[PDB]
Every structure is written in structure tokens, then in C-alpha cells.
């Protein structure tokens, strides 16, 4: 309810990135708290783009590739495979405040160890410090609908519904960010 807890998509207002299918933070668990996004889903070494806060709150920097933003209500968002982090621990931000970019290379994207296909943001929803399901969560005019397995991207099950337009938006297609809803 708090406007400052209202969420937008985690890239700049006025811009469009391609989401993949919802999944858990680990990629093999439950609930489906996360989706990935990238402008073009390119190979390592390509240009990458600005990640922004989905909502207002307190920044905590967990490594050079991971950032958390926590709203006073207890809702929070996690941002992973980051680079060029331009916020500090304890810093106050609002929706659309730039946090950094998603990392363009293996070394920078996987600063904590592990695997990935190529440059993208790994974005997650939390409440009370725990990862929670994205099901029914709103980002601007979009209501997210979660699929039936990790990374499920079949548009009959996984999609964003735009309440301002009556349109359904699928994985691996540009998703426009109009910012916060009134
Ligand atoms: Zn992910």
C-alpha cells in the first residue's frame, strides 16, 4: 500500500528489457521469487545496461555483484550478477534510482562463484528477509503470473498482464517500463 513500497520494473523508466521465466533464487527450489532480465540476452563481452531500484528503501551491498533494497514495510528486492555498483550500505533510494549495471563478463557476473549463460540481471522478491513467490505481484501496471517449474516460459502460464492496456506480455520479448502505478 505504501507508495514507496509500490514497485516498478528494475530498469530505467522509459526503457524495455526482455524477461525470462520465473524461478527460485537458487534456480532449483521453490517459491518462484525471481526472474531474469536483459536488453538483448547477448554473449559475454557485450554492452550491458542500467539496473535501478524497483522501490524505495535501504541499500545493502552484499558483494561487487549483489545488492539488496529493503522497504520499511519489510518488502525487499535482491539484484544479482551486478557490476559498477554506485550505491553504498545504508544508502536511501527510491524507485528508478540507478544501482549499477548487470555484468558483461563471466568474472564480474559470477563474483561469488557459480554458473551463467551470459549477461543478465537476476531479480528477486522478498518479505521479512525471506524469498517469496512473485505470483500476483505488481510492477507498475503489470501483474506477474508465475509458471509451473523453474524458468517455465510458456506464455500460456508465465506472463505479465498489463492492467492499463489489457495486454499480455511474454518471456524473451521487450517489456516497457512506465514506472510506478498511481
Ligand atoms: Zn535468475
UniProtKB/Swiss-Prot annotation:
The active site is at residues 81, 120. Disruption phenotype: Loss of staphylolytic activity (lysis of heat-killed S.aureus). It is found in: Secreted. Disulfide bonds join 65-111, 155-170. Induction: Optimal protein expression in vivo requires both Zn(2+) and Ca(2+) during growth (at protein level). Zn(2+) binds at residues 23, 36, 122. Processing of pro-LasA can occur extracellularly and requires elastase (lasB). Secretion and processing may be linked. Involved in proteolysis and elastolysis (degradation of the host protein elastin). Has staphylolytic activity (degrades pentaglycine cross-links in cell wall peptidoglycan), preferring Gly-Gly-|-X substrates where X is Ala or Gly. Enhances the elastolytic but not proteolytic activity of elastase (lasB) and elastolytic activity of other proteases. Degradation of host elastin is likely to contribute to the pathogenicity of P.aeruginosa. Belongs to the peptidase M23A family. This is Protease LasA. The chain holds residues 237 to 418 of 418 of the full protein.
Amino acid at each position: 500500500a505504501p507508495p514507496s513500497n509500490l514497485m516498478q520494473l528494475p530498469w530505467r523508466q522509459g526503457y524495455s528489457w526482455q524477461p525470462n521465466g520465473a524461478h527460485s533464487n537458487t534456480g532449483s527450489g521453490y517459491p518462484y521469487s525471481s526472474f531474469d532480465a536483459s536488453y538483448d540476452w547477448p554473449r559475454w563481452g557485450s554492452a550491458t545496461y542500467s539496473v535501478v531500484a524497483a522501490h524505495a528503501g535501504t541499500v545493502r551491498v552484499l558483494s561487487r555483484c549483489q545488492v539488496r533494497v529493503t522497504h520499511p514495510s519489510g518488502w525487499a528486492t535482491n539484484y544479482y550478477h551486478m557490476d559498477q555498483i554506485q550505491v553504498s550500505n545504508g544508502q536511501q533510494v527510491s524507485a528508478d534510482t540507478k544501482l549499477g549495471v548487470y555484468a558483461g563478463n563471466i568474472n564480474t557476473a559470477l563474483c561469488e562463484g557459480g554458473s551463467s549463460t551470459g549477461p543478465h540481471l537476476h531479480f528477486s522478491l522478498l518479505y521479512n528477509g525471506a524469498f517469496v513467490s512473485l505470483q500476483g505481484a505488481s510492477f507498475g501496471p503489470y501483474r506477474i503470473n508465475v509458471g509451473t517449474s523453474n524458468y517455465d516460459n510458456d506464455c500460456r502460464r508465465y506472463y505479465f498482464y498489463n492492467q492499463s492496456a489489457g495486454t499480455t506480455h511474454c518471456a524473451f520479448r521487450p517489456l516497457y517500463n512506465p514506472g510506478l502505478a498511481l
